[PDB]
């Protein structure tokens, strides 16, 4: 609206158009209540930089009414104002947003962008989006559109934590083309408007998310496996069958740290004790009941977890009488320690009854005919024995009550989880030792070591991290998405249950993307 | 020299003097070669902030000729220019440094400050310091002295990595007073001079040390013990006897990460294997020789470590035939794993010969009369047995060769180490199991979890970190110094070998201090 | 877009002499050495297509002159030549990186630097000026310099059938450019032009099988990687791994008999190679004598395949009754002592006298071995410097020097009956000889023309500084062979991402 | 360089460009040593004629670096000056050469032309050809 410029393409088979528009007038604050007004380096106003989570692709499949992009107008748009904002208490002013469109004269379709005031819901149809102040582009001639996005507020200047307006981009008319694999690419860049200002210098220690996250180059094999300490991580894994995870040990979150029953020192908390309560259950051998000790939950209330912190979540099976069991060290407690430590078979709760068969509680099986009454015993989970395989260990027992356990999660459609494997050694016995375990592999959703760095540099709100995985000195690079909930996903096309990736390491940070972002790189599982 | 101001104290029993001096004229660069000149927020020039490592105390014991303070003139002096410098490639300009002296009219003594040009050694006598451009203060009347410190250079503007001038402060005449516990306190504050400028905005990801270090509030008991995984850290420890450390597992450094034989995943690397080579040594039972496997050092060259990564460094003793030994799990390797895993006694190298008695090599003892020839075996260090106590485990075996092992370290005179303890459970046996371990405690210099955050935010060059340790909700606070070499020290006055500190946690960052800084808080070991 | 970063003119007031340039080199544009690259629909976003230091090497006239001077000062004016089309649309990014700053990893961090966006349909004839960010009043050779980086911003897409787009850069010194100090013209700059004396491949020696002339050049689909140790040469380092500049001279070796044996239908006796250059057998030096065989015979099948060799007992001033025996590396049934490049071997000799020197001439392989087994080399372990394994960029295949090895038969039970096989070497020392004179431009690859029938047929290969040649092939097959008439010719320097326009059809 | 002219194709789906360039300045001889200076029929200067051996075809197979055309600047370029030269002993002056290209707006590629001074070898790569005036 403010101005328009047209240029002829090379060869004179079309044109490109550059426009500047101000759909909503800007009201400039007088800043009369600001104790001090702090100016910016003048060169910051002249430097367009890419906006985090400001990229998307339009294909013939994309339908109108789906929100492709939604961003708040704040200092986080620009790379340098984001870094500067850590030294200040408040801010005021708008931004100039530039849409870059890679169009062509032999395509068809339209695009719409609009400004949403604060405290207004975003609609899900291009028809309603025309109610807002907006602008429309055509793929045949669009080259770059500059939007003078205003800073809508009812106060003199902003403190941290307010509600802010948004920019929304949507397809107005579907894309068409003779070629079946043509697609339009959209990118956003921003810079503060000349009237942008800061106020009230303060020491630079804030809770914001750093615009750039620095990841130490520690490789995966140098990281611990939460669900199987004492065994190093050997490779990364992708399985098509594993469409969900219900584990409670390898769960970490950006906001509230550990989740469910997880801990930051898996090796330290791997040990527990039981009291060997009376009672027994039937079987060809004789099985015994024991109640786990809860030092952190001395009074067995339903609010706190019912099992020792970070204890164990193998998962034996829905029903396995003489087929599958868990094997652990066990020894009677005496002064100064324990005596006669040897391998025994065990499991969770009773067998026949439901709700106690495979669940978290204090009740556990013991394969000890000579289990002394009301005496304390040691428990080192070790591994599994019988007919157990990888699948049985993968599925953890269910959780019940009101002790805010870790919720089950699934990947977005079209993506698959990435795991940390570990070879669990097999234990064999020739004499009458009692038990014989079998080889098996254990997977963990996430390791605390990787998430440790992320805590120092939090994630920007409503964004995920796109990471590069360098293996052969840069020749081979893989792309993963790291969600705040604490899992990694990859884009796949094939179907395989045994895909292996080396553990050379060197994780690298690429950029911030939306949760619905589609990874450009694709991992072919059929190979 | 430029100006002086005198004021009368309350009660008219003395005066205080404020002076501004420019001992060395400033040459202002024209910045003709700078592609862009970036200005600063004008309010940054008016904000004096404390200089990191800019505090010291003068007592009657302090003698002239000892360097109390030495700082480079760079953007790191000011809190805000340090944060701003991460966005830029170069800088140019001087600083104004203010000395604040807490003097009194009924004391005596003098103080001297000087400016050292680049590439000049700092002398160790006040007599030679008068050769430089300098200024002299008197404790009877000194209140605040402002120094216009110039930016001495022979280039148009600075890049990272140059040599810079320094400010040095020294006692000119010793302090005297009727009271025996009087002492003067000195502090430095700084702000850039009006001609300071930056140049060439670049994305803010640099290798500098952040002016403020943010420490996660994870308590010690949530951290792993490098020298004893599977046992949680239970308390912090101070011992007067332990005047040095020669360990090789709990060694981490700010610059080159792990040191000696340490690893970032102690639990994962705690396991090793041996080959059970031929030969034997005398004894009432029969002992056997075995050679440790080195997957990381397949060819046993003297350049690389001679033992498995992060394996074990207990330390049994200088000579213990039938008194002290190490006890571990052991089992013969078979397809899929190991069989007949049970506790056995072992040690390092042979017994009589020197250089192999207590040293790192592949040779180790095995307490297995039926040790099969040239067969692989598992080794889980577990613990100790016999007459071993805390002292024996504390002293690790020596290291020889040219495999850049971890050097031995000692605390500065008047300070003591702070350790991480862990109760090692005792293993008892009633039947003919073979061995019986004893309770013992294990100490580690540092845990990787604490150092993990420090890697993200490096230390400023030539500085140590002063940390606050909050225990009872802020009521009780302890002060420790964290050195880049990777150990913590505390100021003590008493003499005790069993001082215990809880593990409530909540480490906090206070400020940057010099290595010779003396902690104000004192821990009384006699209580 | 014309000038991402301002260019600050230096007065050169500290230079002892200010040496002016010919006024006419300022006026006309020339192609930038190594400034050519191509964009394809398969190119991934965020991948660096071109990286150049702002230096006198951006122009071939100033590059030639710079061999004669010790200092310089000033920037350059670049012009962009795009061979686009009407159907394809994409977008590029060009940025200036100040000296002492690391190059970013992703396109979104690159936008932090001074930059500007190119659109394929309007990019042609765009002009960019590259300033030089300097510390001193002028540069000394060996300083750290700013650099220009070009990266894919939006991937190339086409409405119609896809076309590749080829990009060229031309440059000329900016009017303030000047030299200084006038030193003799033997400085260390890489010459903008490389002159290759004419030498047909069959006139070159085959390092991995001397005594057999190179018969023809070879391209195979299956051979995806090379792990050889003999035919490895590098312009920066010279001979790599266990290579030598005199393959025939180092072919012969000797070994000393060892105690023991192993199991076999006949008897398998031990031997131990001599190491004149490694007397103490320390871990940091090669385990085997320089230039010795690196053929592989099966991963573990010590009995199915066998290497063969002439062997004779040591005698004063010579050797006696040399005859053909079998041999192989390592003791077999072991990870580190089987099919491994190390000094322990065994010989098929019924009676091998202990602690006696013996000849070892690798000759040829026998048994069930075929050329596929021969090419795979024994693995290397230890701390000594061994040649890294290499693979060509996706879409390209190696070009090998091929030699044919005659077989050997016998009526009498002399011990063996060798099998005819073919030998391949990735590089030959003779071709590298010339390159050492003229260095390669930093991080650039030589594009060579191989013309055969008096100009009628021309093949295009890329020679990498690591020491291998590759060809772009639409098809991939095992049996394709190029004649050996020869006459290599130098074409230009290209970026390693460049894709050869000329294509070789292998399936047909 | 001297001038450029642009025209729209029929249907307005592209353009055609006609240019006049003088990459190397001409030095005009004073002819002070010539016993006689003989002029030409003025109509000969206005008659473009095809140059012998001045035709070639570019296909997708043709590769850069191959010399498609190489001609000496002499009276043999023009049909009438070639016939006239038989009556004379000497000559002096340059020529105007016109390249006619049958292009189309829906193709791609580029072409380069250069002037080689006497006693200089012709290179076999477009990269080196940019060294000459072109």
């Amino acid at each position: 609206m403010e101005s328009s410029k047209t240029e002829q393409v090379t060869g004179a088979t079309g044109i490109t158009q550059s426009t500047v528009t101000a759909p909503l007038p800007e009201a400039v604050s007088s800043l009369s209540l600001a104790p001090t007004v702090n100016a910016l380096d003048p060169w910051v106003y002249l430097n367009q930089t890419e906006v985090p989570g400001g990229t998307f692709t339009v294909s013939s499949a994309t339908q109108p009414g789906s929100v492709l992009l939604e961003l708040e107008i704040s200092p986080e748009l620009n790379l340098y104002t984001s870094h500067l904002f850590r030294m200040y208490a408040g801010w005021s002013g708008g931004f100039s947003l530039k849409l870059l469109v890679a169009g062509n004269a032999f395509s068809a379709g339209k695009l719409i962008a609009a400004i949403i005031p604060p405290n207004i819901e975003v609609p899900n149809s291009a028809y309603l989006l025309t109610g807002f102040p907006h602008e429309i582009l055509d793929f045949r001639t669009a080259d770059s559109m500059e939007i003078i996005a205003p800073d809508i507020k009812n106060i003199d200047y902003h403190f941290r934590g307010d509600k802010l307006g948004k920019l929304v981009v949507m397809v107005y008319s579907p894309l068409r083309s003779t070629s079946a694999d043509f697609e339009i690419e959209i990118k956003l860049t921003s810079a503060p408007l000349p009237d942008f200002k800061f106020t009230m210098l303060v020491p630079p220690i804030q809770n914001n998310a750093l615009p750039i996250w620095s990841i130490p180059q520690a490789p995966p094999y140098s990281m611990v496996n939460p669900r199987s300490p004492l065994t190093p991580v050997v490779e990364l894994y992708i399985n098509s069958s594993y469409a969900t995870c219900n584990h409670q040990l390898g769960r970490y979150t950006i906001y509230q740290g550990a989740i469910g029953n997880s801990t930051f020192n898996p090796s330290g908390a791997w040990t527990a004790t039981c009291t060997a309560e009376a009672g027994s259950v039937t079987g060809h051998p004789n099985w015994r009941y024991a109640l786990l000790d809860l030092p952190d939950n001395p009074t067995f209330d339903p609010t706190l977890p019912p099992v020792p912190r970070g204890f164990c979540d193998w998962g034996s099976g829905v029903k396995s009488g003489n087929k599958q069991h868990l094997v652990c060290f066990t020894g009677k407690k005496v002064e100064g320690g324990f005596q006669d430590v040897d391998t025994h078979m065990w499991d969770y709760g009773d067998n026949e009854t439901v709700g106690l068969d495979n669940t978290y509680q204090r009740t556990i099986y013991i394969k000890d005919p000579s289990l002394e009454k009301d005496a304390q015993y040691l428990v080192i989970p070790m591994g599994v024995s019988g007919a157990a395989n990888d699948d049985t260990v993968q599925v953890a027992p269910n959780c019940y009550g009101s002790w805010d356990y870790a919720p089950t999660v699934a990947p977005p459609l079209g993506e698959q989880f990435v795991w940390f494997r570990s070879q669990l050694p097999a234990s064999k016995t020739t004499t009458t030792s009692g038990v014989n375990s079998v080889p098996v592999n254990v997977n963990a959703l996430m390791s605390p070591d990787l998430m440790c760095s992320a805590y120092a540099s939090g994630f920007p709100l409503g964004k995920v991290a796109l990471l590069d995985y360098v293996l052969f000195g840069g020749s081979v690079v893989r792309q993963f998405k790291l969600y705040p909930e604490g899992y990694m996903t990859a884009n796949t096309t094939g179907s395989n249950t045994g895909f292996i990736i080396p553990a050379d390491g060197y994780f690298r940070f690429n950029s911030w993307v939306s949760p619905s972002f589609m990874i450009s790189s694709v991992v072919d599982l059929n190979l």
Side-chain angles (χ1 to χ4, degrees), chain A residues 52 76 82 86 206-215 252-256 446 450-467 480-488 508-515:
Chain A
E76 308 300 310
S82 179
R86 292 181 181 272
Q206 310 300 33
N207 290 318
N208 298 339
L210 273 167
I212 307 162
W213 174 28
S214 283
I215 284 155
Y252 304 96
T253 300
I254 281 296
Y255 316 123
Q256 68 271 19
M446 185 63 72
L450 178 41
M451 291 300 262
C452 165
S453 66
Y455 291 119
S457 297
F459 281 22
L461 183 63
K463 300 294 187 291
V464 299
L466 185 67
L467 301 174
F480 304 146
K481 290 165 74 203
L482 179 45
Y483 290 76
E485 292 82 3
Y487 46 93
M488 284 192 318
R508 208 169 62 202
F509 169 70
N510 190 359
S511 52
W512 305 107
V513 301
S514 178

Side-chain angles (χ1 to χ4, degrees), chain A residues 4 16 193 428 450:
Chain A
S4 183
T16 72
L193 287 178
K428 307 172 289 188
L450 178 41

Side-chain angles (χ1 to χ4, degrees), chain A residues 98-148:
Chain A
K98 222 187 286 293
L99 263 168
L100 305 197
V101 187
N104 190 256
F106 296 90
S107 65
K110 293 201 195 283
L111 187 66
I112 175 158
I115 296 168
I116 316 303
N119 291 99
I120 294 301
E121 294 294 328
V122 174
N124 288 280
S125 66
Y127 161 59
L128 299 191
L129 213 63
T130 68
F132 301 93
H134 65 277
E135 194 72 38
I136 290 163
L137 296 75
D138 188 289
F139 297 131
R140 277 180 292 175
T141 68
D143 171 45
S144 67
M145 188 177 80
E146 180 166 341
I147 310 148
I148 300 320

Side-chain angles (χ1 to χ4, degrees), chain A residues 186-465:
Chain A
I186 304 299
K187 292 183 183 292
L188 264 176
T189 66
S190 76
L193 287 178
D195 59 290
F196 186 92
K197 301 275 160 180
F198 280 117
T199 178
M200 277 185 290
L201 271 160
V202 299
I205 189 66
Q206 310 300 33
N207 290 318
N208 298 339
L210 273 167
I212 307 162
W213 174 28
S214 283
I215 284 155
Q217 295 183 357
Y221 64 89
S222 172
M223 323 194 168
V224 63
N225 183 331
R227 277 177 92 240
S228 165
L230 295 174
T231 61
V233 182
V234 186
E235 68 260 14
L236 303 182
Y237 194 56
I238 295 159
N239 207 302
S240 296
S241 296
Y242 308 163
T244 176
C245 166
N246 77 333
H247 303 171
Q248 314 265 336
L249 293 175
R251 310 295 299 264
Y252 304 96
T253 300
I254 281 296
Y255 316 123
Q256 68 271 19
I259 302 299
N261 194 359
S262 307
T263 187
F264 282 123
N265 188 359
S267 49
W270 192 250
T271 285
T273 59
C274 64
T275 188
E277 182 63 26
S280 178
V281 65
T282 61
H284 180 74
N286 209 55
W287 306 356
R288 292 294 312 274
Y289 285 173
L291 281 178
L292 282 170
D293 297 341
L294 304 194
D296 48 8
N297 190 0
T299 301
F300 181 76
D301 63 357
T303 301
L304 305 201
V307 297
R309 193 89 208 171
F311 168 50
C312 197
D313 66 357
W314 292 101
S316 66
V318 65
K319 182 64 69 177
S320 296
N322 296 114
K323 291 177 71 68
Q324 315 171 333
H325 271 148
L326 300 188
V327 63
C328 71
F329 290 83
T330 316
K332 184 177 184 293
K333 185 182 286 186
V334 297
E335 68 277 16
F338 312 90
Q339 60 157 5
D340 316 293
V341 163
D342 66 5
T343 60
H344 291 280
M345 267 158 77
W346 71 285
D347 218 330
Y348 264 107
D350 63 358
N351 190 359
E352 70 275 16
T353 289
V354 194
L356 275 187
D357 178 350
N358 63 347
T359 310
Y360 288 168
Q361 61 288 347
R362 300 162 66 191
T363 62
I364 52 153
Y365 282 173
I366 300 296
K367 181 63 66 67
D368 183 28
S370 66
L371 184 64
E372 181 65 26
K373 183 63 66 68
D374 66 359
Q376 294 178 356
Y377 288 77
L378 183 63
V379 176
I380 303 299
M382 183 182 287
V384 309
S385 67
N389 59 47
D390 295 0
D391 292 331
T392 61
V393 176
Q394 177 57 25
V395 192
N398 320 311
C399 291
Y400 294 142
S402 63
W403 60 279
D404 51 6
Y405 46 81
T408 186
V409 298
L413 183 57
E415 316 194 353
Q416 312 274 39
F417 282 128
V418 184
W419 309 90
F420 294 99
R421 292 178 66 87
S422 178
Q423 298 305 141
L424 183 63
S427 188
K428 307 172 289 188
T429 62
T430 81
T431 62
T432 302
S433 297
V435 306
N436 264 11
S437 65
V438 296
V440 65
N441 305 274
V442 193
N443 300 307
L445 214 60
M446 185 63 72
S447 165
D449 300 326
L450 178 41
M451 291 300 262
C452 165
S453 66
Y455 291 119
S457 297
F459 281 22
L461 183 63
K463 300 294 187 291
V464 299

